[PDB]
Design a protein around this nucleic acid. Structure first.
Lengths: 149, 132, 187
RNA sequence: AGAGUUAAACAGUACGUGAAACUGCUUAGAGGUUAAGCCCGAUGAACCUGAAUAUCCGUUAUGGAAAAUUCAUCAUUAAAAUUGUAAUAUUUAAAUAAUAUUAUGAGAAUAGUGUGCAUUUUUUCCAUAUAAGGACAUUGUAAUCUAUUAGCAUAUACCAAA
RNA sequence: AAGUGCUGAUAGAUUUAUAUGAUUACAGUGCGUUAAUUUUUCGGAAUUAUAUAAUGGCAUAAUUAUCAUUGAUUUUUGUGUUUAUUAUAUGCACUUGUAUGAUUAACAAUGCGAAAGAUUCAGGAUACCUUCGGGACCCGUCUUGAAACACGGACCAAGGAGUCUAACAUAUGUGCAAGUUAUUGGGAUAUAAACCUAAUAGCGUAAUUAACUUGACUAAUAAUGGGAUUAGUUUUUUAGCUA
RNA sequence: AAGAUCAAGGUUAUGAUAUAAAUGUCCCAGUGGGCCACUUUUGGUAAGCAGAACUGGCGCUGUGGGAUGAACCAAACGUAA
RNA sequence: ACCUAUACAUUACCGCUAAAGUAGAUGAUUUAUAUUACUUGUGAUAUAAAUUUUGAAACUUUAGUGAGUAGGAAGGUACAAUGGUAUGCGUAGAAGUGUUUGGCGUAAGCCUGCAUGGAGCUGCCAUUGGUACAGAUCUUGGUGGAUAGUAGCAAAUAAUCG
């Protein structure tokens, strides 16, 4: 880890003002502490760089317990990565006792998202919540979405 | 006597005088050990004539005369016998310089070994002594 | 009164890779011997391409190796990547080639070796092809990184799509005054 | 103050070690030019440091003296390694390659013997020699080289006016 | 305007030229073609007597540009005549010859390494003294500017001031990588370490709207598509060069 | 009208140059108290005064020169012959 | 005509920047020769002689330039500690410290000698910091010039014989 031997503050001895300019010397809190005055002196610096700083986009949601809404997402970009790699080539086979029934829910992703374009191979996806578009491309691949606990 | 290291161009010491630090002759608190004048009032820093010399690179010795003692021999700090044995092949660039912490009994061995190897020692009279 | 030996005379570019890696510099030393001794620009840029910082070296994924095959006049090609080679799960069919790389991630080595391709070190590509015959030099996507987004962070001039430096994304995190026409101004 | 004691009082009760500031003495030197202090150059004093070898046109030629023995010119004998090659195993199935093991051939040397083991050779020392006993150092002249300064001596061209 | 010819003085002269890099080029001289004239008058030396190429000068002709045409000048080309000049046809041996891109040495004198011991010579702003010239105003600092009749600092020693930590951005290195982070804890111990590591959680893997919400389409692929500037490679085709 | 496909083109169509240039990141220090001169100027009788325009210095710059000197002149300083 | 800046020219030398090569050693290269091939003259091979073991995270080699506060970066130096190491040093004298010892480096600073000393200590590669002082009307201790004596030690007379 650490060396103050790699610090340049070591090197700045002496250099009389240690990189903290002779005329205007670095003295404790020259611009007012923190985000102060953000309506005044730092107004340039806040809208630049943080702009939405300040007011409101109000819809106060008293007691959002983020278990109701949590809903993690898998894309239809990916979705075939739920299928173990040596079985992934095994169902490209061509052999049907089929179609591909992937349990999305036990892979922990509440919601199947739309993102588009999978191989023509039919996939049945067992998922709680649907992108209608994810289902639309799955139905074009000839599978289905079977809706799932 | 001892045969000089490898044909040097004459060692230009180019500024010889210890840089001494500005006003060491004014003050015993200000040590002769050089410390560069950074300060806004310095006549030394603006290099006015007659305010001595600030170590500027151009006093720098030729990279051939770099290290050579004027009897040729560059200094190798010899802790003991095995250390001496390094400079057996390197008579003609290096001298054994017996570290001050070494006792006389070992020094007698070092000096003796040094004569065998025919490598110069700079200080033999080191720790010698009409003594036990 | 030299009018004018101002600047820049410090230039720009690494003579030697900024890395302690004893392996990496041996490849540089190898290709540096191959540069002027055998002419040809494949030696000239691979020497440079080892100098490269980790950024400007961003990981080339296996589907990018597989799209290059679809290229005309490219079927017999030993794909060069001076880089980390990363496994793309989404490519169902990974085509045969020998791929020469600095590092290949272990999941990427299995899908090259399954293909059935060889995963090769650059020193064995140098032996095979000192004339760089039938190579293809691939460079990664640097545009991907989160740092590139943040640069240019400016409000005013009808831009940015830049991402403000925000620890937390949500409502009450910089949705309000200055993002929207409602709370004074549009970005 | 002597003396004793102690390895040492250069450990004798601010006591291990022992600084600076500062002061006395001694030793050297000077003293009206800035009060003093200072740097550089030249320079004297004290003080110190550095100091090399063989050759004109080359240092080889030649002679003597000593010593060597695997090698010495090389042969043989023994000892183990190297170069190249192959096999059997492993590594990577297999290939090339590499590695362990094993084997062959080419050779070179460490020890022993041998023409000789100073028939001679070779190795090792010494002397003498051509301009000259030299090139470390400092000096002379002359020939050159780079930058430059300052003259000399030689001969034209053209233009105006004449 | 002509290296036509030539003298003096000044300072410099890295020369590790095989650390892991050159010593090559030319010239002189001798060798074995001859003759003739001349000079020294000995040894030798010069010029003249060939072929080839170039160039200038003469005459002639064509073009092209130009000052104006009486006459000149230009760039290009050809031809004839004669003459001069210069280069090529001048190889090999030897060479203290010239240069070889920082080419200082021929040649010589002197001191002297004279065993340990140690003479003699050369060279020196060590400390410091001396003698001469010249230069040197007090640092730190704020300040436009400090030697200031600006401020602190009598003098000296030792403590003594851009840190640590949480959380953060950027640069970079490292590990692994579409994932990563074990160390909350448990297993274990050579012990507050190392080794092992259940399970989550964090962040990343979709964002944006206030939120409800919905979902980046195209294609297994298209590093976003197309397009324009871009590298690197393979590649049609051709030329030159080298092997 | 754009995107734009196709074919034609002697010499690239002022002059010197390029210390290579362009580009990005740091959101980096330091600065936000200037001072002086040529020239141009406003206020003021004027000022070593208050304030602009352009440009150079000084600020951050000694050295040589103006006897002297922050700034003017000449000139930008590795170390020496 | 003369004088003359760190300017200007040249040269050696420092640094920084630039620009180029350097990395077949069971091999390469040079030199001399004997043999063989071709040829006039060259190469191959054999032999003998010689050079070459490159911090190739540097050297050899090259050129142009250097004011500098604020500031930035780069590379060292010193100081205390720690892992490793030099089969480190050491009471036969460590460390410390005084020091016209000698020398090295542009410097930061280093070593050594000599004297004093008495018990422990250092170099190198990595590793961490309460890490380097002249100052802060700095702190704390010590010490000067003022000044071995200048202020003064003087109000209430002030003793004195002895």
């Amino acid at each position: 880890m650490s060396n103050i031997k790699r610090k340049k503050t070591r090197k700045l001895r002496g250099h009389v003002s240690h990189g903290h300019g002779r005329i205007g010397k670095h003295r404790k809190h020259p611009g007012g502490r923190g985000n102060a005055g953000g309506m005044h002196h730092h107004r340039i610096n806040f809208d630049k760089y943080h702009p939405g700083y300040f007011g409101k986009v109000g819809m106060r949601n008293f007691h959002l317990r983020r278990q109701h809404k949590f809903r993690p997402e898998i894309n239809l970009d990916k979705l075939w990565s739920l299928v173990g790699a040596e079985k992934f080539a095994e169902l490209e086979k061509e052999k049907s006792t089929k179609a591909p029934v992937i349990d999305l829910v036990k892979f922990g992703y509440y919601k199947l998202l739309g993102r588009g374009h999978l191989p023509a191979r039919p996939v049945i996806v067992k998922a709680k919540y649907f992108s209608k578009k994810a289902e639309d491309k799955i139905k074009k691949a000839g599978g289905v979405c079977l809706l799932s606990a | 006597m001892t045969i000089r290291p490898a044909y040097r161009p004459k060692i230009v010491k180019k500024r010889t005088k210890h840089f001494i630090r500005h006003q060491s002759d004014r003050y015993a608190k200000l040590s002769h050990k050089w410390r560069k004048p950074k300060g806004i009032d310095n006549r030394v820093r603006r290099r006015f004539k007659g305010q001595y010399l600030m170590p500027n690179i151009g006093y720098g010795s030729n990279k051939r005369t770099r290290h050579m003692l004027p009897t040729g021999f560059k200094k190798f700090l010899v802790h003991n016998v095995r250390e001496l044995e390094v400079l057996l092949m390197q008579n003609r660039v290096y001298c054994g310089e017996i570290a001050h912490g070494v006792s006389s009994k070992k020094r007698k061995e070092i000096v003796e070994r040094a004569k065998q190897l025919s490598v110069r020692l700079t200080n033999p009279n080191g720790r010698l002594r009409s003594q036990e | 009164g030299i009018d004018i030996n101002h600047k820049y005379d410090r230039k720009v570019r690494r003579t030697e890779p900024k890395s302690q890696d004893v392996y990496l510099r041996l490849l540089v030393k190898l290709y540096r011997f191959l540069q002027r001794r055998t002419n040809k620009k494949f030696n000239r840029i691979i020497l440079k391409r080892l100098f490269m910082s980790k950024i400007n070296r961003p990981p080339l994924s296996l589907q990018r190796i597989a799209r290059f095959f679809k290229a005309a006049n490219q079927p017999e090609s030993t794909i060069v990547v001076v880089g980390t080679v990363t496994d793309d799960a989404r490519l169902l069919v990974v085509p045969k080639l020998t791929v020469c790389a600095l590092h290949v991630t272990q999941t990427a080595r299995e899908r090259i070796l399954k293909a059935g391709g060889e995963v090769l070190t650059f020193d064995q590509l140098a032996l095979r092809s000192p004339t760089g015959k039938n190579t293809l030099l691939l460079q990664g996507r640097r545009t991907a990184r989160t740092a590139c987004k943040h640069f240019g962070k400016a409000p005013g001039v009808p831009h940015s799509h830049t991402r403000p430096y925000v620890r937390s994304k949500g409502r009450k995190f910089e949705r309000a005054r200055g993002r929207r026409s409602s709370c004074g101004y549009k970005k």
